[PDB]
């Protein structure tokens, strides 16, 4: 996260870390949506251009963390994966369209003051909150510049008007993506960066006080460059796929 601050303890209890076993390294961010399911970006698991194709057995999910490199004994939980489901139409060849994946944990995790699931939006919440100018929050242990943080970082970014998003790149934007960030002319900065992929973009409903995950960190061209924005997967538009694998393969 660039130009963000350290998070507070228990500020994002749904934040997850996808950790590789060998080498033992942070791979991506992810989020907890129930006691047995994690949501992340499909490119974190499959990206053939760079020969990336991970299997259950190669990953570990660390939940309840704050510190990036320490094993937070008695606070975090490490789970193994039972199954990984990538969106059948994830487009890694052209623009990472439908960059979403679900991971089923081997065993359910128990919630605590540091482990709690985020809500997935419903048509109405998406409708009222995904408006240009409204700010959302992104969290992650990714790069600070285009070193790394010791603690989870957070930054609040405004959603941008879709034309502005399309006119900032040469990549074809789809309705399954939205972009966020400040305009060169807004004197504020911030963006996600390498290592933040897969993590959550959330908003707090002023109607019922709950936090909803509206997006997943997907891509950007550089980090916090002026005139560019970060792109996020539109969770609500892919929710029927989510519903389907969950009630087709578990809960």
């Amino acid at each position: 996260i660039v130009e963000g601050s350290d998070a507070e303890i228990g500020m994002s209890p749904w934040q997850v870390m996808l950790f590789r076993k060998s080498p033992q390294e942070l791979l991506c961010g992810a989020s907890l949506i129930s006691d047995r399911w994690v949501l992340t970006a499909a490119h974190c698991l499959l990206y053939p251009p760079w020969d990336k194709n991970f299997t259950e057995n190669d990953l570990l999910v660390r939940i309840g963390k704050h510190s990036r490199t320490r094993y937070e004994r008695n606070i975090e939980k490490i789970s193994m994966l039972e199954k990984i489901y990538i969106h059948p139409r994830y487009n890694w060849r052209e623009n990472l369209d439908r960059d979403i994946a679900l991971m089923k944990l081997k065993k359910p995790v128990a919630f605590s003051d540091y482990i709690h699931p985020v809500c997935l939006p419903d048509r109405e919440t998406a409708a009222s909150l995904l408006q240009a100018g409204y700010k959302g929050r992104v969290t992650g242990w990714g790069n600070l510049k285009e070193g790394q943080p010791s603690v989870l970082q957070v930054v609040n970014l405004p959603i941008v008007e879709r034309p502005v998003c399309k006119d900032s790149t040469r990549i074809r934007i789809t309705d399954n993506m939205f972009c966020a960030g400040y305009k060169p002319d807004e004197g504020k900065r911030g963006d996600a960066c390498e290592g933040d992929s897969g993590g959550p973009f959330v908003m707090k409903s002023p109607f019922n006080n709950r936090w909803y995950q509206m997006g997943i960190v997907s891509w950007g061209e550089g980090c916090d460059r002026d005139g560019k924005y970060g792109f996020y997967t539109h969770v609500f538009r892919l929710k029927k796929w989510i519903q389907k694998v969950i009630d087709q393969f578990g809960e």
Binding site: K21, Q24, E25, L26, L60, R62, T69, R70, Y71, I78
Partner: peptide
């Protein structure tokens, strides 16, 4: 840079 995690989680 990461700290070692308990062997039981690799196995």
């Amino acid at each position: 840079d990461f700290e070692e995690i308990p062997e039981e989680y690799l196995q």
